[PDB]
């Protein structure tokens, strides 16, 4: 499952653009790069309606999945909209990644793992991915 | 090396298209999907300049990589140029592939290994992937 994009290797100063749909009535929807879906440098959250969060971005890491999450960062500079179409553009170096939303934020989080390599990226939730672009 | 995008399923049905840009100067330029770099469903190879080939397409597919190259199907109905964008879309079902190239011409070729799930893309050549879509 998923597809194996050979050419794209998502270093440190590349810029890796993912695309795509937010539903209609949407709860949350994430992007999340790292080494698995259960070691994520970075799980970007855009939380619509989720119980106290309305509107709320919120960035966190994992090690172990669902039961390692972190130290999660937050911003109420929310500029998604549910249904429309979304492209938000990543890079990092070793420090940091630097996260690029179209029409909307630039936020940056720690690069807590000191990765300089991130072979896998999924979105979650509800929203669909239609591109992915590096630069 | 490479991404792993996990969301993109290219099974019968879907559209992936691929972008990017030809160099300039080119001899050729493939794109492959299968199941690695050995075991390839489909090898479309863009010849600008490559000996006797000038302008032509060759389509292909390997079980054994280099060494096992298969019955080549050829069209001369060559659109791409040097130095330029481009965007090919692939789909198939069981029996066939069909490779709509933007402005330029639509090619089939047999599905030889009946697979309705191609987990490995790569573009290879004088050519950069900058763009993955499917739908």
């Known amino acids: 499952g998923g597809l ?3 050419n794209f290797d998502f270093t440190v100063g590349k810029f890796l653009t993912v695309g795509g749909f ?3 009535s949407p709860q949350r929807f994430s ?3 790292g080494e698995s879906m259960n070691s994520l440098s970075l799980h970007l959250d855009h939380r619509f309606n989720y119980g106290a969060d309305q509107n709320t971005i ?3 890491s994992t090690l172990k999945g669902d039961n390692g999450w972190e ?4 911003s109420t500079n929310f500029t998604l909209s549910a249904g429309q179409y979304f492209e938000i553009t990543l890079s990092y170096d070793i420090n940091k990644f630097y996260i690029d ?3 909307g934020p630039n936020l940056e ?6 990765k300089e390599f991130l072979p896998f990226l999924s ?4 929203a669909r991915l239609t591109l992915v672009k590096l630069e």
């Open 22 to 24: 937010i539903n209609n």
């Open 31 to 33: 992007v999340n790069v």
């Open 71 to 74: 130290t999660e960062q937050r």
């Open 4 to 6: 194996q994009v050979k």
């Open 123 to 126: 979105l979650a939730g509800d």
């Open 101 to 103: 939303i179209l029409d």
């Open 58 to 60: 919120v960035m966190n």
């Open 109 to 114: 989080f720690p690069n807590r793992y000191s």
